[PDB]
Amino acid sequence: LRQEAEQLKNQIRDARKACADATLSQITNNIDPVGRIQMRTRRTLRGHLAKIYAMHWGTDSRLLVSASQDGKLIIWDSYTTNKVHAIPLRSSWVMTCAYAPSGNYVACGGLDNICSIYNLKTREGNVRVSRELAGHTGYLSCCRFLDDNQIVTSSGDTTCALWDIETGQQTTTFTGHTGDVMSLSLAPDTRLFVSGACDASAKLWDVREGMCRQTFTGHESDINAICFFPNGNAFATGSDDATCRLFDLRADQELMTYSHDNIICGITSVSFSKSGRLLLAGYDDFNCNVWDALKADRAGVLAGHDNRVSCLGVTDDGMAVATGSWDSFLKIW
Amino acid sequence: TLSAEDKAAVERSKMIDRNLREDGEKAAREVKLLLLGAGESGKNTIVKQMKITGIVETHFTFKDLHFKMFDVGAQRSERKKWIHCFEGVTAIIFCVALSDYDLVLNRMHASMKLFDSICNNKWFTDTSIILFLNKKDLFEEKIKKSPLTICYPEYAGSNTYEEAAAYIQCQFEDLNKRKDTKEIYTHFTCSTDTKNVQFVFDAVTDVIIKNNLKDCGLF
């Protein structure tokens, strides 16, 4: 059957070329550029003593959770820099963290396959492990909360797992990737989500159906970052090949590619602003570059990090952008 | 200005900062060690005898030094996506069983390739490697009948453990493309009680001394 798959892949490529009547770059020629954009380090979150790999903004645009190799999650009050909570972790090897949309639960994980769930509204006051989600055979990569009861997880098993927090069982298993999954992104309605994989392809999945819907290709190296467009119809990706590509679910094809000759390092994190016109991506050269999602031009550079930009996120309302780095500091722009 | 609730929140944040500083100091005082090697390389027995689904952390103390060993053998994923997490490890413990020279993956070549990749990894440029040659008794018992030439065609001389394990160690060290910046510590493992722990302690002390010397400008 390996002969048929190549022919049908060629057919899909032909169809994608056919539907590509025009390109975003050509049509967006008359669109006025956003101009040169700058953001100042309004807040410098200090208190971490090890590399920071993940962070997530809360639905209120004020509380944000961060994960570092110290084995402790710090909940920061972005408006005052105060540490709302300090959550010791059973394993210091934590690479991902998630903040529940309601703000009642927080999840994290890393080299340990168990995805710890933490409750911030405990009657005891101190944060305790709500439940341990075990069953993965690979290092956990990303976490995203659909609600207080449903969470989608991606790990190095090459399969993304859907977990029911109340029972702790794997509600659904997503399969189809040929490499380790490194990133996750939930749609605005949470019905659909996409995950980046080391196979240089991004696969779209339907939570309700529990199966893949689309697969996107074009990257040359491992995909490390992925984020949905605010409208929920498109998403951007980041990969080690130092290029960021925008894909549309409806078109099932790449819309724009963001890369520069002098940028030789890969992309670790990617996110969209509230309007989606500005694309912010992290890099291994301890700086962040803002790319025009329409004109593909580098609007600005968010410099100030010392070692490496690993995680990046935008508030729910887009008021500010918080970018983590390996120097154990998170800067809010 | 800050209100009463804001002042209390600030005080709580400062207390959390104090706790974080204490935890970071405790982590700094304790030594972090990374474990690598094949499943049958004896690393399992090494971890079992040094204990005084995913990664396993083995915390133990010896002569006032708190040692925590990380076993990443259970991670069946490409290292480069997560190997960077161990950039700050003081030393890396690599376990190789000398009896694999005649095994079938030639898994000795696979172990050599893994050692080469780890040693020349850009994250471990300044990280020393503590090489553990395991199952030396079986290696010497079997070499007298099975020559070492199976794995190393270039090997010459008598086939005895004394001049065979040393040759294996030299071949392993030949993979060093950056001998100037990093160092390798090699030990021979037996059915000991604490000699391996003693060697680990000595290697950690030597690494600390070398780091201090480099900070002084020497070495």
Epitope: Y79, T80, E124, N126 | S3, A4, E5, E11, K14
Partner: single-chain antibody
């Protein structure tokens, strides 16, 4: 839960140690307040100690005479009382509180102990002394303060407490907008500067009690005269 011990009869000018044992929660990270209620009057804040004993405050009426200390290993809170006056007679309540964004200070109140003896603060006003009520009838309680509680940060620091007969006061609404955990969604609070109100819709059983409005702008903390529902 919080339980208090050390009450009894004390002659005027004497000393009596008051202790509060804490269990079922991380007492170390919870701030502690002492509130006394006279047998025929409303609540009155006594002293406050922050987590770790880093900050300690006392009311002007008990400044110096009363000392508040904590002992984390035993999860016990102590209040050294000396030179007691006649007016000091009241039932002391052990209050649990934690301060962080989105927190609910004064969420839990201890059972309390009865103490009897032989013989520029913010003013909180509750003109609605009493309002006879029956099940199925909506209720509105108005509380007034001499200072605007709308802080520059945007948070309105107002707290509502309901004290059923024979039971210690329980947090009802904190910051005028957030309902305490476990409180039914029936209760609601809203208002503007210098004027606050508490509204209860479709009252029914287990609603009879005294409602106290408290301000948390700065110490010393003050409580209103109290609105009695019957």
């Amino acid at each position: 839960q919080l339980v208090e011990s050390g009450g009894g009869l004390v002659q005027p000018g004497g000393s009596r140690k008051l202790s509060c044992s804490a269990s079922g929660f991380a007492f170390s990270s919870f701030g502690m307040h002492w509130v006394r209620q006279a047998p025929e009057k409303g609540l009155e804040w006594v002293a406050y100690i922050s987590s770790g004993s880093g900050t300690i405050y006392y009311a002007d009426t008990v400044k110096g005479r009363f000392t508040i200390s904590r002992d984390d290993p035993k999860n016990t809170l102590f209040l050294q009382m000396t030179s007691l006056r006649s007016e000091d007679t009241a039932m002391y309540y052990c209050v649990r509180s934690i301060y962080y964004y989105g927190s609910s200070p004064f969420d839990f109140w201890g059972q309390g102990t009865t103490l009897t003896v032989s013989s520029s603060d913010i003013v909180m006003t509750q003109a609605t002394s009493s309002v006879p009520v029956t099940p199925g009838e909506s209720v509105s309680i108005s509380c007034r303060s001499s200072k605007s509680l709308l802080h520059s940060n945007g948070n309105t620091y107002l707290y509502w407490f309901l004290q059923r007969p024979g039971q210690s006061p329980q947090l009802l609404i904190y910051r005028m907008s957030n309902l305490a955990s476990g409180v039914p969604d029936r209760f609601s609070g809203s208002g503007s500067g210098t004027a606050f109100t508490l509204t209860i819709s479709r009252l029914e059983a287990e609603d009879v009690g005294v409602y106290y409005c408290m301000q948390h702008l700065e110490y010393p903390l003050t409580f209103g005269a109290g609105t009695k529902l019957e």
